[model samples]
Target chain A: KDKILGVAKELFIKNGYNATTTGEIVKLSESSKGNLYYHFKTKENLFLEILNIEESKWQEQWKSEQIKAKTNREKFYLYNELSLTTEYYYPLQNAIIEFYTEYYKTNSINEKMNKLQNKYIDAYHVIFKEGNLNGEWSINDVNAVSKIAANAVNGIVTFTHEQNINERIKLMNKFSQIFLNGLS
Target chain B: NLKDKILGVAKELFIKNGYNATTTGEIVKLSESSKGNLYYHFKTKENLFLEILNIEESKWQEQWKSEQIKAKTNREKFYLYNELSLTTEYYYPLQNAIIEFYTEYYKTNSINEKMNKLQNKYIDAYHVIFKEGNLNGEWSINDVNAVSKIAANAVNGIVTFTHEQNINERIKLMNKFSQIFLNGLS
Candidate 1:
């Protein structure tokens, strides 16, 4: 069951949730149908389980980075500058966005995924708040402005997925500068 | 019958008026469905709304995944990814609609998830370009992570700028994205 879970996780990320199949899961997991069925009743159940796993993985990775950095500047830059590395991005953020768009559609399933989405979305504001307390971020109104930045960043990703990178970076930096500028 | 009618009206109503303004009563009256049926299928307005979005989202993704033209190289795929980023027929309306929803309706929603979304196909497309470029040695050690974030912001900045500025100025901003980002070609 663990082996099935492990393989499905990788294949699902690469191919996405729907495209990947139970047959593939079984083959990749190196487990029998009985073992797979014993644990997960259906594909959605398996996906829900994987979604939960990724949620924690995202938090643990991000939160660890949070604790590791003594300074808020370190944390902010860590999120911004250094996080660009290929190896650094473990779970693909974009894949989950599309996945949730699907998962939430079948509302009966993937509660954990919703929880994960909320956690990450909520974490942004909290991080900004912590940045202020710890001297990592600056905002006149932590809640309001950070939310704007949050939405803008999210919108940028939607646009960026389809547009050019240089502009995306320049535009984001410009916004961040304004955001940073507002703080000072 | 009520469920079908509700979704049918919802497909257009919510898209036009958006989710917040639309109500179950509205759905019921518009679709000519009894209140019982509306409630029976979808417990609440939010549930129904979420269901509509899911349907739209699935249609959009199906379209997104459909593009599989053979690439000359990673560069082509990279460019193709960006071109596809705009969300043409099935995806754009839903996406733009959601953007409107988030911007207008909800204060609680944050950009973290959106940022990740932008990064994925948006950022991932660029990564393919960068990686292939690296493999082919096209661009300098083009670190896509840094570059994609930059590019994502630039377009985002322009969107806000467009809302306020004149079309001509907006063109300039748009051009900045082109000349600076894709070298005026891709």
Candidate 2:
């Protein structure tokens, strides 16, 4: 299972979801077709598993480091900054969107993707609530502010193909700055 | 001659009724053209709609460019765009029709391709304005391209949302969006 996921992640990023085939994954993983199916059940399931793995990595890391922030403002910056490279910069995360676009009929992919995205919003909601209570800033509606911030992030990430690594990071940092600074 | 005539009637039907309600037979009969001729001019109704989109889009761009040149600051330019967007009487129906067609006919590759193309085009246009702002020192943005893309998408979201709203509400929302975005830049 590990080898299959490792190989699939590499292929999905390098060649894209549509270009990479299950046959190629089987060959690259150096595993039998029957074993691959036995573990993942289907190609789509395999891709989802890879996505879950990728999501958990940085999400766990973000959670650990986020507590160290002394202020809500700092936490806001930290959240977006951490996500810059992990959630937004990671090619795998973007590939999941591409994969879903191609296979939107699959309720599993759609539901899981929406749930994963909501978790990101929920994280911001908590930070906003904390900020409101701490008197870090006056926010009438944490949910609405978080939604706007999320919308901005969603909009920019859609065009990641048009930007470079350095440029992408700058945008992410700048986005957080503008978002926090605007309300402040 | 026939193509132009068909398109003329087709455009009216699209604006008056909607994309889904207007059909090939309706278009052909109204235009007084044969079905084969209508098909010959455009492979499908969506193709005819694409023609309308092209004409409408070009006219919009021309007018916007003319208005855009008058602005002195990035904030001013963006605000001006919002104002124009709010004021433009014919903009939403066509835009909404295109969106509706794109969504309802998800199976067609050409429509989807065209939709993506239009989206990218709008983003590129926004990118140019933001780059201009950076160069002129109107606002300091770290990633102009990314910010512009985001801004463009925000505009798209607002436009789509405003379609269901009344005029007063639409203007209010546009004003709110402009303030937040311009504040972000500042």
Give the runs in model 1 whose Cα sits over 4 Å from its true position: A81-90, A134-179, B1-186
Per residue, candidate 2 scores C-alpha lDDT tens digits across B27-138 of 9999998889987878888788877888887888888888898988877888778667656742566654554464443334556577566667667767777888889887
After superposing all C-alphas onto the true structure, candidate 1 shows an RMSD in angstroms of 15.9
Q: What are the per-model numbers of colliding residue pairs?
A: 20, 0
Error of 2 at B126 (Å): 3.3
Give per-model TM-scores. Answer: 0.45, 0.59
Cα interface RMSD of each candidate? 11.8, 7.4
After superposition, which runs of candidate 2 have C-alpha atoms over 4 Å from their true positions? A87-89, A154-167, B1-124, B127-178
Worst 10 residues of 1 chain B by lDDT: B103-112
